[PDB]
Design a protein around this ligand. Structure first.
Ligand SMILES: NC(=O)C1=CN([C@@H]2O[C@H](COP(=O)(O)OP(=O)(O)OC[C@H]3O[C@@H](n4cnc5c(N)ncnc54)[C@H](OP(=O)(O)O)[C@@H]3O)[C@@H](O)[C@H]2O)C=CC1
Ligand SMILES: CN(Cc1cnc2nc(N)nc(N)c2n1)c1ccc(C(=O)N[C@@H](CCC(=O)O)C(=O)O)cc1
Length: 186
């Protein structure tokens, strides 16, 4: 019960993963940016909630699990309890959001960040209400086996700027990328 946002890093051909990992070499400032966006809460004494499907939870290195300073929720219909290190397990995105409204969490969470994977995004994308997409455009093609859903530009507007988000083209390990913010309201 705060903002609902999706954050993703996409190659030119819309890939986000390849054999359980992201397709390019590690980009430390892309990770630094992902960490600060998802960890920074807007209010005082609140923490943001991160929602992720199971394959995404297992692609984070064990040392980095759970993602520090955030409430980590995993989506799965197969698991019986949250994986080791996870704070909550939900069977569906609606239940994950119905949970935020439990007195439990109702007072602790600021923003909800959808961090993947593809089915998770596809659904938050069609979910109604106000939604922002924070897209990292990796400007090169990468062999992938999982993709980000098509952004409908009649519903999503690309913003010209956003506070805290660099506007220039970045480059790291010879890969250029840029940060984009899209907003919907329906
Ligand atoms: N570049 C980037 O930004 C990102 C890259 N990644 C990478 O992308 C790929 C992750 O892949 P993807 O296959 O899309 O995986 P998810 O992380 O979406 O895992 C899919 C599993 O999560 C559960 N799940 C997914 N959607 C839901 C739902 N709506 N309700 C309940 N359970 C759900 C199901 O678990 P079950 O079968 O147990 O029911 C499903 O088998 C990896 O390669 C990862 O490293 C991931 C995130 C962002
Ligand atoms: C598999 N993967 C998914 C992944 C990677 N890049 C992304 N980039 C963005 N922009 N959006 C995403 N949703 C995203 N997700 C991972 C892998 C590692 C960590 C992770 O270790 N993150 C640390 C960052 C520490 C660091 O490398 O600086 C954290 O505290 O956020 C996160 C996501």
């Amino acid at each position: 019960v705060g903002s609902l946002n999706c954050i993703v890093a996409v190659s030119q051909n819309m890939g986000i993963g390849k054999n359980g990992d992201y397709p390019w070499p590690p980009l430390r400032n892309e990770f630094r940016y992902f960490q600060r966006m998802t960890t920074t809460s807007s209010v005082e004494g609140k923490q943001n909630l991160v929602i992720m499907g199971k394959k995404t939870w297992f692609s984070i290195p064990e040392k980095n699990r759970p993602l520090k300073g955030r409430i980590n929720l995993v989506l799965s219909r197969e698991l019986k309890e949250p994986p080791q290190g996870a704070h909550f397990l939900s069977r569906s995105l609606d239940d994950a959001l119905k949970l935020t409204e439990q007195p439990e969490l109702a007072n602790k969470v600021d923003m909800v960040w959808i961090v993947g994977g593809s089915s998770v995004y596809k659904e938050a994308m069609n979910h109604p209400g106000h939604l922002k997409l924070f897209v990292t455009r990796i400007m090169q093609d990468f062999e992938s086996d999982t993709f980000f859903p098509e952004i409908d530009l009649e519903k999503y507007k690309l913003l010209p700027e956003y506070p805290g988000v660099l506007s220039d083209v970045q480059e790291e390990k010879g890969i250029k990328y840029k940060f984009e913010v899209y907003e919907k309201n329906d």
